[PDB]
Amino acid sequence: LTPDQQTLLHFIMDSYNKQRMPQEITNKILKEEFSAEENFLILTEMATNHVQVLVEFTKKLPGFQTLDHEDQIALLKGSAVEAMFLRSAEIFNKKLPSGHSDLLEERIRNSGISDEYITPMFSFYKSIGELKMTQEEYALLTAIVILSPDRQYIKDREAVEKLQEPLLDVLQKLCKIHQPENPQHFACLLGRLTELRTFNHHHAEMLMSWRVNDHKFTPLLCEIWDVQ
């Protein structure tokens, strides 16, 4: 835990900790009626608000602002779902209070989402949870997930990579040192990053279905996910 790193994380957990999501909004997961229609309206609201929170959080990441303006957008579009899946997964596993996990689960399970997609998404939640990830880990991955250079329609992969590389290292250290019990923890964590990617096809297809069954998202969501 070098001083270069031991404070850098505190900046990051400082960001990750900022209670961006409005209680007034999340509360609707609990208080509103439960139906296919209402469930879907509720989830869009959370997701669109979350997209705002991610863009806020993403800014506060180190050396993000020094990035290419055109470049910056491609990371957000690509990493938006994976980031969203991380927090949503974080909720169920960690049973966050603002999460309303049980009731959030009910909504999701009756949002007009197919079983093909519902089964795996919920497998992922279970498995990632059994990992017993710390808050440190969650926030750190989210950062790693956002900066992944492999993301499509990018040019300056190296510039992001430098921004990313420090973070991978801090985790590499943290999991092994905090968890010498096993050294495969880094392997497990990064393994999931692959697992997340599986949902980008899943999610593109979920949007397609919703669309065709006359659901409509927000101007913000449509933009980030490239919805006609």
Binding site: Q52, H69, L76, K77, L220, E223
Partner: peptide
Amino acid sequence: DHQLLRYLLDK
């Protein structure tokens, strides 16, 4: 373009 995202960043 991607007008909304850009505004979000600068905002």
